[PDB]
PDB file of C-alpha atoms and ligand atoms in Angstrom:
ATOM      1  CA  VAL A   3     -60.624  14.334 -51.020  1.00  0.00           C
ATOM      2  CA  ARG A   4     -56.806  14.439 -51.510  1.00  0.00           C
ATOM      3  CA  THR A   5     -54.881  12.020 -49.303  1.00  0.00           C
ATOM      4  CA  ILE A   6     -51.507  10.386 -48.740  1.00  0.00           C
ATOM      5  CA  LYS A   7     -50.587   7.255 -46.797  1.00  0.00           C
ATOM      6  CA  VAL A   8     -48.237   7.821 -43.834  1.00  0.00           C
ATOM      7  CA  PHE A   9     -47.261   5.713 -40.838  1.00  0.00           C
ATOM      8  CA  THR A  10     -47.456   6.774 -37.222  1.00  0.00           C
ATOM      9  CA  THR A  11     -45.329   5.325 -34.435  1.00  0.00           C
ATOM     10  CA  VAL A  12     -44.158   5.738 -30.867  1.00  0.00           C
ATOM     11  CA  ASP A  13     -41.059   3.472 -31.098  1.00  0.00           C
ATOM     12  CA  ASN A  14     -39.993   3.753 -34.806  1.00  0.00           C
ATOM     13  CA  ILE A  15     -40.436  -0.042 -35.113  1.00  0.00           C
ATOM     14  CA  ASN A  16     -44.160  -0.784 -34.883  1.00  0.00           C
ATOM     15  CA  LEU A  17     -45.861   1.238 -37.627  1.00  0.00           C
ATOM     16  CA  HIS A  18     -49.507   2.210 -37.858  1.00  0.00           C
ATOM     17  CA  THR A  19     -50.971   2.886 -41.325  1.00  0.00           C
ATOM     18  CA  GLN A  20     -52.850   6.197 -41.659  1.00  0.00           C
ATOM     19  CA  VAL A  21     -54.581   7.969 -44.512  1.00  0.00           C
ATOM     20  CA  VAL A  22     -54.302  11.721 -44.030  1.00  0.00           C
ATOM     21  CA  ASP A  23     -56.278  14.529 -45.598  1.00  0.00           C
ATOM     22  CA  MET A  24     -53.851  16.952 -47.208  1.00  0.00           C
ATOM     23  CA  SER A  25     -56.163  19.863 -46.444  1.00  0.00           C
ATOM     24  CA  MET A  26     -55.799  19.415 -42.648  1.00  0.00           C
ATOM     25  CA  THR A  27     -52.750  19.856 -40.419  1.00  0.00           C
ATOM     26  CA  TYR A  28     -51.142  16.813 -38.846  1.00  0.00           C
ATOM     27  CA  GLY A  29     -52.204  18.186 -35.469  1.00  0.00           C
ATOM     28  CA  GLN A  30     -55.868  18.245 -36.504  1.00  0.00           C
ATOM     29  CA  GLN A  31     -55.612  14.540 -37.413  1.00  0.00           C
ATOM     30  CA  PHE A  32     -53.125  13.011 -34.926  1.00  0.00           C
ATOM     31  CA  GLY A  33     -52.422  15.527 -32.180  1.00  0.00           C
ATOM     32  CA  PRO A  34     -48.771  16.583 -31.704  1.00  0.00           C
ATOM     33  CA  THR A  35     -46.824  15.060 -34.584  1.00  0.00           C
ATOM     34  CA  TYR A  36     -43.096  14.902 -35.341  1.00  0.00           C
ATOM     35  CA  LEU A  37     -40.987  14.025 -38.392  1.00  0.00           C
ATOM     36  CA  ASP A  38     -37.493  12.941 -37.290  1.00  0.00           C
ATOM     37  CA  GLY A  39     -37.676  15.338 -34.364  1.00  0.00           C
ATOM     38  CA  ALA A  40     -39.190  18.294 -36.201  1.00  0.00           C
ATOM     39  CA  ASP A  41     -42.579  19.414 -34.891  1.00  0.00           C
ATOM     40  CA  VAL A  42     -45.035  19.151 -37.850  1.00  0.00           C
ATOM     41  CA  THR A  43     -48.214  19.605 -35.724  1.00  0.00           C
ATOM     42  CA  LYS A  44     -49.008  22.959 -37.438  1.00  0.00           C
ATOM     43  CA  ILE A  45     -48.074  21.764 -40.945  1.00  0.00           C
ATOM     44  CA  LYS A  46     -50.245  20.206 -43.686  1.00  0.00           C
ATOM     45  CA  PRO A  47     -49.069  17.023 -45.462  1.00  0.00           C
ATOM     46  CA  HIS A  48     -46.506  17.408 -48.284  1.00  0.00           C
ATOM     47  CA  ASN A  49     -46.331  15.103 -51.296  1.00  0.00           C
ATOM     48  CA  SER A  50     -42.867  14.027 -50.164  1.00  0.00           C
ATOM     49  CA  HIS A  51     -44.344  12.800 -46.867  1.00  0.00           C
ATOM     50  CA  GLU A  52     -45.991   9.805 -48.500  1.00  0.00           C
ATOM     51  CA  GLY A  53     -44.821   6.573 -46.931  1.00  0.00           C
ATOM     52  CA  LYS A  54     -42.809   8.290 -44.184  1.00  0.00           C
ATOM     53  CA  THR A  55     -42.980   7.625 -40.450  1.00  0.00           C
ATOM     54  CA  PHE A  56     -44.190  10.221 -37.968  1.00  0.00           C
ATOM     55  CA  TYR A  57     -43.980  10.075 -34.195  1.00  0.00           C
ATOM     56  CA  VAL A  58     -47.172  10.787 -32.285  1.00  0.00           C
ATOM     57  CA  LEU A  59     -47.990  10.852 -28.586  1.00  0.00           C
ATOM     58  CA  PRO A  60     -49.431   7.702 -27.011  1.00  0.00           C
ATOM     59  CA  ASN A  61     -53.091   8.527 -27.539  1.00  0.00           C
ATOM     60  CA  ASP A  62     -54.698   5.059 -27.552  1.00  0.00           C
ATOM     61  CA  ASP A  63     -54.137   1.871 -25.561  1.00  0.00           C
ATOM     62  CA  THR A  64     -52.058   0.168 -28.288  1.00  0.00           C
ATOM     63  CA  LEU A  65     -49.635   3.101 -28.400  1.00  0.00           C
ATOM     64  CA  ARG A  66     -49.538   3.438 -24.600  1.00  0.00           C
ATOM     65  CA  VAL A  67     -48.383  -0.221 -24.314  1.00  0.00           C
ATOM     66  CA  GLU A  68     -45.891   0.167 -27.215  1.00  0.00           C
ATOM     67  CA  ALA A  69     -44.407   3.305 -25.639  1.00  0.00           C
ATOM     68  CA  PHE A  70     -44.072   1.822 -22.160  1.00  0.00           C
ATOM     69  CA  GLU A  71     -42.528  -1.408 -23.437  1.00  0.00           C
ATOM     70  CA  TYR A  72     -39.956   0.529 -25.497  1.00  0.00           C
ATOM     71  CA  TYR A  73     -39.080   3.390 -23.083  1.00  0.00           C
ATOM     72  CA  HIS A  74     -40.085   2.102 -19.586  1.00  0.00           C
ATOM     73  CA  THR A  75     -41.761   5.453 -18.713  1.00  0.00           C
ATOM     74  CA  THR A  76     -45.333   6.730 -18.700  1.00  0.00           C
ATOM     75  CA  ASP A  77     -44.441  10.431 -18.262  1.00  0.00           C
ATOM     76  CA  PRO A  78     -46.959  12.147 -20.574  1.00  0.00           C
ATOM     77  CA  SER A  79     -44.430  14.669 -21.850  1.00  0.00           C
ATOM     78  CA  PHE A  80     -41.651  12.132 -22.560  1.00  0.00           C
ATOM     79  CA  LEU A  81     -42.051  11.675 -26.304  1.00  0.00           C
ATOM     80  CA  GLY A  82     -42.396  15.418 -26.940  1.00  0.00           C
ATOM     81  CA  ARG A  83     -39.241  16.068 -24.924  1.00  0.00           C
ATOM     82  CA  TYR A  84     -37.369  13.273 -26.727  1.00  0.00           C
ATOM     83  CA  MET A  85     -38.407  14.699 -30.098  1.00  0.00           C
ATOM     84  CA  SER A  86     -37.537  18.282 -29.057  1.00  0.00           C
ATOM     85  CA  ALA A  87     -34.044  17.179 -28.022  1.00  0.00           C
ATOM     86  CA  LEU A  88     -33.538  14.959 -31.135  1.00  0.00           C
ATOM     87  CA  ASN A  89     -34.206  17.928 -33.416  1.00  0.00           C
ATOM     88  CA  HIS A  90     -30.977  19.356 -31.976  1.00  0.00           C
ATOM     89  CA  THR A  91     -28.845  16.268 -31.359  1.00  0.00           C
ATOM     90  CA  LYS A  92     -29.345  15.028 -34.932  1.00  0.00           C
ATOM     91  CA  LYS A  93     -27.295  18.132 -35.945  1.00  0.00           C
ATOM     92  CA  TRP A  94     -24.419  17.459 -33.551  1.00  0.00           C
ATOM     93  CA  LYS A  95     -21.206  15.752 -34.696  1.00  0.00           C
ATOM     94  CA  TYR A  96     -19.921  12.562 -33.039  1.00  0.00           C
ATOM     95  CA  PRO A  97     -16.203  12.163 -33.821  1.00  0.00           C
ATOM     96  CA  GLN A  98     -14.247   9.077 -32.875  1.00  0.00           C
ATOM     97  CA  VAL A  99     -11.622  10.271 -30.343  1.00  0.00           C
ATOM     98  CA  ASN A 100      -9.013   7.710 -29.156  1.00  0.00           C
ATOM     99  CA  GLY A 101     -11.381   4.944 -30.287  1.00  0.00           C
ATOM    100  CA  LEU A 102     -14.486   6.220 -28.477  1.00  0.00           C
ATOM    101  CA  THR A 103     -17.547   8.072 -29.672  1.00  0.00           C
ATOM    102  CA  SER A 104     -17.390  11.653 -28.386  1.00  0.00           C
ATOM    103  CA  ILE A 105     -19.509  14.756 -29.132  1.00  0.00           C
ATOM    104  CA  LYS A 106     -18.267  17.947 -30.778  1.00  0.00           C
ATOM    105  CA  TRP A 107     -19.148  20.819 -28.488  1.00  0.00           C
ATOM    106  CA  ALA A 108     -22.539  22.425 -29.172  1.00  0.00           C
ATOM    107  CA  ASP A 109     -25.506  23.633 -27.133  1.00  0.00           C
ATOM    108  CA  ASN A 110     -23.746  23.367 -23.766  1.00  0.00           C
ATOM    109  CA  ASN A 111     -23.307  19.600 -24.165  1.00  0.00           C
ATOM    110  CA  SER A 112     -19.946  18.964 -22.364  1.00  0.00           C
ATOM    111  CA  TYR A 113     -21.605  17.004 -19.509  1.00  0.00           C
ATOM    112  CA  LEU A 114     -23.163  14.694 -22.126  1.00  0.00           C
ATOM    113  CA  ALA A 115     -19.829  14.083 -23.868  1.00  0.00           C
ATOM    114  CA  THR A 116     -18.114  12.976 -20.692  1.00  0.00           C
ATOM    115  CA  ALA A 117     -21.095  10.784 -19.708  1.00  0.00           C
ATOM    116  CA  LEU A 118     -21.090   9.147 -23.187  1.00  0.00           C
ATOM    117  CA  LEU A 119     -17.323   8.600 -23.026  1.00  0.00           C
ATOM    118  CA  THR A 120     -17.644   7.074 -19.523  1.00  0.00           C
ATOM    119  CA  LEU A 121     -20.362   4.624 -20.556  1.00  0.00           C
ATOM    120  CA  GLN A 122     -18.074   3.165 -23.241  1.00  0.00           C
ATOM    121  CA  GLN A 123     -15.496   2.296 -20.560  1.00  0.00           C
ATOM    122  CA  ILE A 124     -17.673   0.541 -17.972  1.00  0.00           C
ATOM    123  CA  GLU A 125     -19.662  -2.676 -18.125  1.00  0.00           C
ATOM    124  CA  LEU A 126     -23.361  -1.729 -18.188  1.00  0.00           C
ATOM    125  CA  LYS A 127     -26.456  -3.207 -19.804  1.00  0.00           C
ATOM    126  CA  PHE A 128     -29.569  -1.071 -20.192  1.00  0.00           C
ATOM    127  CA  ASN A 129     -33.089  -2.394 -19.629  1.00  0.00           C
ATOM    128  CA  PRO A 130     -35.367  -0.213 -21.890  1.00  0.00           C
ATOM    129  CA  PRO A 131     -35.141  -1.356 -25.496  1.00  0.00           C
ATOM    130  CA  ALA A 132     -34.955   2.313 -26.473  1.00  0.00           C
ATOM    131  CA  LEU A 133     -31.639   2.675 -24.620  1.00  0.00           C
ATOM    132  CA  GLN A 134     -30.293  -0.715 -25.729  1.00  0.00           C
ATOM    133  CA  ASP A 135     -30.926   0.144 -29.377  1.00  0.00           C
ATOM    134  CA  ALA A 136     -29.713   3.741 -29.183  1.00  0.00           C
ATOM    135  CA  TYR A 137     -26.588   2.857 -27.192  1.00  0.00           C
ATOM    136  CA  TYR A 138     -25.660   0.267 -29.826  1.00  0.00           C
ATOM    137  CA  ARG A 139     -25.939   2.974 -32.500  1.00  0.00           C
ATOM    138  CA  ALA A 140     -23.961   5.409 -30.297  1.00  0.00           C
ATOM    139  CA  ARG A 141     -21.042   2.960 -29.959  1.00  0.00           C
ATOM    140  CA  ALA A 142     -20.992   2.682 -33.743  1.00  0.00           C
ATOM    141  CA  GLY A 143     -20.792   6.508 -33.994  1.00  0.00           C
ATOM    142  CA  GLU A 144     -24.452   7.493 -34.558  1.00  0.00           C
ATOM    143  CA  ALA A 145     -25.244   8.821 -31.090  1.00  0.00           C
ATOM    144  CA  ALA A 146     -28.024  11.386 -31.818  1.00  0.00           C
ATOM    145  CA  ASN A 147     -30.886   9.216 -30.571  1.00  0.00           C
ATOM    146  CA  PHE A 148     -28.956   8.117 -27.465  1.00  0.00           C
ATOM    147  CA  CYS A 149     -28.108  11.696 -26.538  1.00  0.00           C
ATOM    148  CA  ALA A 150     -31.703  12.848 -27.013  1.00  0.00           C
ATOM    149  CA  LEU A 151     -32.874   9.929 -24.831  1.00  0.00           C
ATOM    150  CA  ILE A 152     -30.410  10.900 -22.075  1.00  0.00           C
ATOM    151  CA  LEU A 153     -31.893  14.437 -22.118  1.00  0.00           C
ATOM    152  CA  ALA A 154     -35.437  13.090 -22.002  1.00  0.00           C
ATOM    153  CA  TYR A 155     -34.830  10.507 -19.228  1.00  0.00           C
ATOM    154  CA  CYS A 156     -33.094  13.199 -17.129  1.00  0.00           C
ATOM    155  CA  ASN A 157     -35.742  15.884 -17.807  1.00  0.00           C
ATOM    156  CA  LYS A 158     -33.115  18.213 -19.189  1.00  0.00           C
ATOM    157  CA  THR A 159     -33.520  20.326 -22.305  1.00  0.00           C
ATOM    158  CA  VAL A 160     -30.815  21.066 -24.833  1.00  0.00           C
ATOM    159  CA  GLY A 161     -28.729  23.909 -23.475  1.00  0.00           C
ATOM    160  CA  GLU A 162     -29.600  23.389 -19.793  1.00  0.00           C
ATOM    161  CA  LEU A 163     -26.862  23.055 -17.145  1.00  0.00           C
ATOM    162  CA  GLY A 164     -26.337  19.385 -16.349  1.00  0.00           C
ATOM    163  CA  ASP A 165     -24.495  17.441 -13.617  1.00  0.00           C
ATOM    164  CA  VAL A 166     -22.568  14.262 -14.520  1.00  0.00           C
ATOM    165  CA  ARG A 167     -23.342  12.457 -11.230  1.00  0.00           C
ATOM    166  CA  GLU A 168     -27.096  13.069 -11.540  1.00  0.00           C
ATOM    167  CA  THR A 169     -27.055  12.085 -15.219  1.00  0.00           C
ATOM    168  CA  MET A 170     -25.290   8.829 -14.437  1.00  0.00           C
ATOM    169  CA  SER A 171     -27.803   8.128 -11.666  1.00  0.00           C
ATOM    170  CA  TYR A 172     -30.695   8.329 -14.164  1.00  0.00           C
ATOM    171  CA  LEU A 173     -28.926   6.052 -16.617  1.00  0.00           C
ATOM    172  CA  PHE A 174     -28.073   3.533 -13.871  1.00  0.00           C
ATOM    173  CA  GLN A 175     -31.708   3.414 -12.747  1.00  0.00           C
ATOM    174  CA  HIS A 176     -32.461   2.104 -16.235  1.00  0.00           C
ATOM    175  CA  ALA A 177     -29.606  -0.426 -16.196  1.00  0.00           C
ATOM    176  CA  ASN A 178     -29.419  -3.962 -14.829  1.00  0.00           C
ATOM    177  CA  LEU A 179     -27.339  -3.533 -11.646  1.00  0.00           C
ATOM    178  CA  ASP A 180     -29.412  -5.975  -9.635  1.00  0.00           C
ATOM    179  CA  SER A 181     -26.474  -8.181  -8.603  1.00  0.00           C
ATOM    180  CA  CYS A 182     -24.312  -5.277  -7.400  1.00  0.00           C
ATOM    181  CA  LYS A 183     -23.770  -5.356  -3.633  1.00  0.00           C
ATOM    182  CA  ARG A 184     -21.945  -3.115  -1.149  1.00  0.00           C
ATOM    183  CA  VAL A 185     -21.348  -3.728   2.591  1.00  0.00           C
ATOM    184  CA  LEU A 186     -20.275  -0.773   4.766  1.00  0.00           C
ATOM    185  CA  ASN A 187     -19.317  -0.539   8.431  1.00  0.00           C
ATOM    186  CA  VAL A 188     -19.646   2.718  10.408  1.00  0.00           C
ATOM    187  CA  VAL A 189     -17.692   2.935  13.672  1.00  0.00           C
ATOM    188  CA  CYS A 190     -18.370   5.533  16.377  1.00  0.00           C
ATOM    189  CA  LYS A 191     -16.150   5.539  19.439  1.00  0.00           C
ATOM    190  CA  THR A 192     -19.241   6.353  21.550  1.00  0.00           C
ATOM    191  CA  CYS A 193     -21.998   4.376  19.830  1.00  0.00           C
ATOM    192  CA  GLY A 194     -20.215   1.270  18.502  1.00  0.00           C
ATOM    193  CA  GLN A 195     -20.404  -0.203  15.014  1.00  0.00           C
ATOM    194  CA  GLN A 196     -23.224  -0.587  12.505  1.00  0.00           C
ATOM    195  CA  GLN A 197     -23.077  -2.538   9.250  1.00  0.00           C
ATOM    196  CA  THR A 198     -25.242  -1.648   6.231  1.00  0.00           C
ATOM    197  CA  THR A 199     -25.846  -3.424   2.940  1.00  0.00           C
ATOM    198  CA  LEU A 200     -26.639  -1.550  -0.258  1.00  0.00           C
ATOM    199  CA  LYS A 201     -27.892  -2.967  -3.563  1.00  0.00           C
ATOM    200  CA  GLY A 202     -28.213  -1.949  -7.172  1.00  0.00           C
ATOM    201  CA  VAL A 203     -27.448   1.677  -8.062  1.00  0.00           C
ATOM    202  CA  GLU A 204     -26.719   2.575  -4.417  1.00  0.00           C
ATOM    203  CA  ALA A 205     -24.072  -0.175  -4.373  1.00  0.00           C
ATOM    204  CA  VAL A 206     -22.006   1.497  -7.124  1.00  0.00           C
ATOM    205  CA  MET A 207     -22.276   5.226  -6.348  1.00  0.00           C
ATOM    206  CA  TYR A 208     -20.743   7.159  -3.441  1.00  0.00           C
ATOM    207  CA  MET A 209     -20.784  10.928  -2.754  1.00  0.00           C
ATOM    208  CA  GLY A 210     -18.118  12.462  -0.545  1.00  0.00           C
ATOM    209  CA  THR A 211     -14.684  11.290  -1.737  1.00  0.00           C
ATOM    210  CA  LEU A 212     -13.071  10.700  -5.122  1.00  0.00           C
ATOM    211  CA  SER A 213     -10.649   8.082  -3.774  1.00  0.00           C
ATOM    212  CA  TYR A 214     -11.653   4.413  -3.808  1.00  0.00           C
ATOM    213  CA  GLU A 215      -8.634   3.639  -1.634  1.00  0.00           C
ATOM    214  CA  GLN A 216      -9.724   6.269   0.932  1.00  0.00           C
ATOM    215  CA  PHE A 217     -13.208   4.666   1.019  1.00  0.00           C
ATOM    216  CA  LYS A 218     -11.584   1.305   1.860  1.00  0.00           C
ATOM    217  CA  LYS A 219      -9.410   2.904   4.553  1.00  0.00           C
ATOM    218  CA  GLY A 220     -12.295   4.927   6.008  1.00  0.00           C
ATOM    219  CA  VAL A 221     -13.968   8.325   5.584  1.00  0.00           C
ATOM    220  CA  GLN A 222     -15.110  10.593   8.414  1.00  0.00           C
ATOM    221  CA  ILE A 223     -18.832  11.333   8.673  1.00  0.00           C
ATOM    222  CA  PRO A 224     -21.084  12.739  11.415  1.00  0.00           C
ATOM    223  CA  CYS A 225     -22.650  10.459  13.963  1.00  0.00           C
ATOM    224  CA  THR A 226     -26.014  11.415  15.428  1.00  0.00           C
ATOM    225  CA  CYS A 227     -24.367  11.490  18.883  1.00  0.00           C
ATOM    226  CA  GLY A 228     -22.192  14.432  17.677  1.00  0.00           C
ATOM    227  CA  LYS A 229     -18.887  12.661  17.352  1.00  0.00           C
ATOM    228  CA  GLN A 230     -17.287  12.004  14.004  1.00  0.00           C
ATOM    229  CA  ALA A 231     -17.540   8.351  13.016  1.00  0.00           C
ATOM    230  CA  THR A 232     -15.594   6.393  10.407  1.00  0.00           C
ATOM    231  CA  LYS A 233     -17.316   4.738   7.423  1.00  0.00           C
ATOM    232  CA  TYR A 234     -15.424   2.084   5.496  1.00  0.00           C
ATOM    233  CA  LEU A 235     -16.043  -0.334   2.681  1.00  0.00           C
ATOM    234  CA  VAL A 236     -16.222  -3.958   3.948  1.00  0.00           C
ATOM    235  CA  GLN A 237     -17.279  -5.743   0.745  1.00  0.00           C
ATOM    236  CA  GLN A 238     -17.912  -4.757  -2.884  1.00  0.00           C
ATOM    237  CA  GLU A 239     -19.380  -6.876  -5.724  1.00  0.00           C
ATOM    238  CA  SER A 240     -19.794  -4.894  -8.964  1.00  0.00           C
ATOM    239  CA  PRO A 241     -17.995  -4.416 -12.301  1.00  0.00           C
ATOM    240  CA  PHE A 242     -17.171  -0.765 -11.561  1.00  0.00           C
ATOM    241  CA  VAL A 243     -17.620   1.828  -8.844  1.00  0.00           C
ATOM    242  CA  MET A 244     -18.215   5.573  -9.167  1.00  0.00           C
ATOM    243  CA  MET A 245     -16.757   7.920  -6.554  1.00  0.00           C
ATOM    244  CA  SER A 246     -18.057  11.500  -6.613  1.00  0.00           C
ATOM    245  CA  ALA A 247     -17.453  14.728  -4.709  1.00  0.00           C
ATOM    246  CA  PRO A 248     -17.881  18.486  -5.084  1.00  0.00           C
ATOM    247  CA  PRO A 249     -15.184  19.709  -7.495  1.00  0.00           C
ATOM    248  CA  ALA A 250     -11.782  19.937  -5.914  1.00  0.00           C
ATOM    249  CA  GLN A 251      -8.201  19.966  -7.100  1.00  0.00           C
ATOM    250  CA  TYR A 252      -7.171  16.332  -7.305  1.00  0.00           C
ATOM    251  CA  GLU A 253      -4.282  14.424  -8.819  1.00  0.00           C
ATOM    252  CA  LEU A 254      -5.123  11.534 -11.171  1.00  0.00           C
ATOM    253  CA  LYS A 255      -2.448   8.837 -11.431  1.00  0.00           C
ATOM    254  CA  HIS A 256      -1.976   6.732 -14.520  1.00  0.00           C
ATOM    255  CA  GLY A 257      -3.101   3.132 -14.019  1.00  0.00           C
ATOM    256  CA  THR A 258      -5.020   3.739 -10.753  1.00  0.00           C
ATOM    257  CA  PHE A 259      -8.498   4.475 -12.195  1.00  0.00           C
ATOM    258  CA  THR A 260     -10.520   4.008 -15.374  1.00  0.00           C
ATOM    259  CA  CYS A 261     -11.790   7.483 -16.227  1.00  0.00           C
ATOM    260  CA  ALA A 262     -12.855  10.706 -14.581  1.00  0.00           C
ATOM    261  CA  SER A 263     -14.777  13.952 -15.097  1.00  0.00           C
ATOM    262  CA  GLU A 264     -13.369  17.420 -14.439  1.00  0.00           C
ATOM    263  CA  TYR A 265     -15.566  20.496 -13.867  1.00  0.00           C
ATOM    264  CA  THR A 266     -14.237  24.052 -14.212  1.00  0.00           C
ATOM    265  CA  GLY A 267     -16.612  26.780 -13.108  1.00  0.00           C
ATOM    266  CA  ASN A 268     -19.181  27.452 -10.413  1.00  0.00           C
ATOM    267  CA  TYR A 269     -22.674  26.392  -9.438  1.00  0.00           C
ATOM    268  CA  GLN A 270     -24.306  28.426 -12.233  1.00  0.00           C
ATOM    269  CA  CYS A 271     -21.792  28.096 -15.085  1.00  0.00           C
ATOM    270  CA  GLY A 272     -19.010  25.714 -16.064  1.00  0.00           C
ATOM    271  CA  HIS A 273     -17.477  23.223 -18.425  1.00  0.00           C
ATOM    272  CA  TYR A 274     -16.722  19.500 -18.161  1.00  0.00           C
ATOM    273  CA  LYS A 275     -13.747  17.542 -19.565  1.00  0.00           C
ATOM    274  CA  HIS A 276     -13.109  13.783 -19.584  1.00  0.00           C
ATOM    275  CA  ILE A 277      -9.870  12.077 -18.475  1.00  0.00           C
ATOM    276  CA  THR A 278      -9.217   8.469 -19.422  1.00  0.00           C
ATOM    277  CA  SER A 279      -6.290   6.306 -18.193  1.00  0.00           C
ATOM    278  CA  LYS A 280      -4.975   4.146 -21.049  1.00  0.00           C
ATOM    279  CA  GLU A 281      -1.349   3.810 -22.207  1.00  0.00           C
ATOM    280  CA  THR A 282      -1.018   7.414 -20.901  1.00  0.00           C
ATOM    281  CA  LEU A 283      -3.546   9.956 -19.567  1.00  0.00           C
ATOM    282  CA  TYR A 284      -5.779  11.344 -22.307  1.00  0.00           C
ATOM    283  CA  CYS A 285      -7.947  14.377 -21.784  1.00  0.00           C
ATOM    284  CA  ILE A 286     -10.934  14.404 -24.160  1.00  0.00           C
ATOM    285  CA  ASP A 287     -12.843  17.678 -24.422  1.00  0.00           C
ATOM    286  CA  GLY A 288     -15.539  17.045 -26.987  1.00  0.00           C
ATOM    287  CA  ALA A 289     -13.647  16.790 -30.263  1.00  0.00           C
ATOM    288  CA  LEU A 290     -10.393  17.951 -28.666  1.00  0.00           C
ATOM    289  CA  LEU A 291      -7.670  15.618 -27.400  1.00  0.00           C
ATOM    290  CA  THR A 292      -4.506  16.200 -25.353  1.00  0.00           C
ATOM    291  CA  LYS A 293      -2.177  13.846 -23.435  1.00  0.00           C
ATOM    292  CA  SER A 294      -0.019  14.060 -20.323  1.00  0.00           C
ATOM    293  CA  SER A 295       1.868  11.750 -17.980  1.00  0.00           C
ATOM    294  CA  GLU A 296       0.352  13.460 -14.896  1.00  0.00           C
ATOM    295  CA  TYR A 297      -2.953  15.222 -14.373  1.00  0.00           C
ATOM    296  CA  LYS A 298      -4.277  17.648 -11.735  1.00  0.00           C
ATOM    297  CA  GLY A 299      -7.552  19.486 -11.913  1.00  0.00           C
ATOM    298  CA  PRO A 300     -10.963  20.058 -10.355  1.00  0.00           C
ATOM    299  CA  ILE A 301     -12.247  16.509 -10.477  1.00  0.00           C
ATOM    300  CA  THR A 302     -15.872  15.638  -9.669  1.00  0.00           C
ATOM    301  CA  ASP A 303     -16.266  11.944 -10.490  1.00  0.00           C
ATOM    302  CA  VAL A 304     -13.826   9.024 -10.797  1.00  0.00           C
ATOM    303  CA  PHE A 305     -14.639   5.527 -12.099  1.00  0.00           C
ATOM    304  CA  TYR A 306     -12.744   2.384 -11.069  1.00  0.00           C
ATOM    305  CA  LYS A 307     -12.836  -1.190 -12.281  1.00  0.00           C
ATOM    306  CA  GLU A 308     -13.991  -3.783  -9.772  1.00  0.00           C
ATOM    307  CA  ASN A 309     -15.055  -7.381  -9.583  1.00  0.00           C
ATOM    308  CA  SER A 310     -15.040  -8.589  -5.990  1.00  0.00           C
ATOM    309  CA  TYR A 311     -13.463  -6.865  -2.985  1.00  0.00           C
ATOM    310  CA  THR A 312     -13.485  -8.091   0.610  1.00  0.00           C
ATOM    311  CA  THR A 313     -11.732  -6.138   3.412  1.00  0.00           C
TER     312      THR A 313
HETATM  313 CL1  LIG B   1     -44.875   2.576 -32.316  1.00  0.00          CL
HETATM  314 ZN1  LIG B   2     -21.948   8.142  17.971  1.00  0.00          ZN
END
């Protein structure tokens, strides 16, 4: 008999009018239900809920299409994981540090801070509307939805150990890198030379050396014949490149790179910091900021500006 009007949604844009019975839980009426990230499935409607928007899972064809068009995923657990993360990230603080949105440390989130800082320094356009909209808000300082989307797209929960390289790979999958192109040549003194072309995400990421100049000069890799061959960059067309390696002591020189991530710890436990090269070297550690003219530390990922390179 007693009812309120609420709206359900999967994208927080398209609303769906509902009349709910205040004697039944939201779960009994909608399935799993969330109010700005909080799980209200086991709760009965409150007077204050009238007119508010609730997220639900895509449980009919209209919602399935809305959810795919907004998020570009059909993983059945995506919206519940996004909501579970948002209930935490909405409580984080996002200070402006040296002109960039950072994240005050909470919930083991240092890998997310350095990823967020990196994104604001490289040219990248996302494809899912969810990421376009949330990234716009993040740049303005309201990064809770963007951070909870990063967790959901990477299948990481709040508090879980994350890797910056893997996180960036997920975000780049959902970005328009279609025009990026990389040409490599591999030279074996026994077998001869082989050229390879890479496209998209694989054209901007490399694992094995932090140094873009070393990649141009040549890096040693195994050949199937048993000798060590040399791999070198012949041609690059992209607005940035990302060079990654297992953490190692490495010296970062002012003016020779855009930004970098530093990892202190081991394979089970550690902490990330961000280094950015501007008028000097700034080290951003969540809300914390220090400066130096030189920098040495256990670097894992370095980003460089690019446009067009030909050997
Ligand atoms: Cl919706
Ligand atoms: Zn060979």
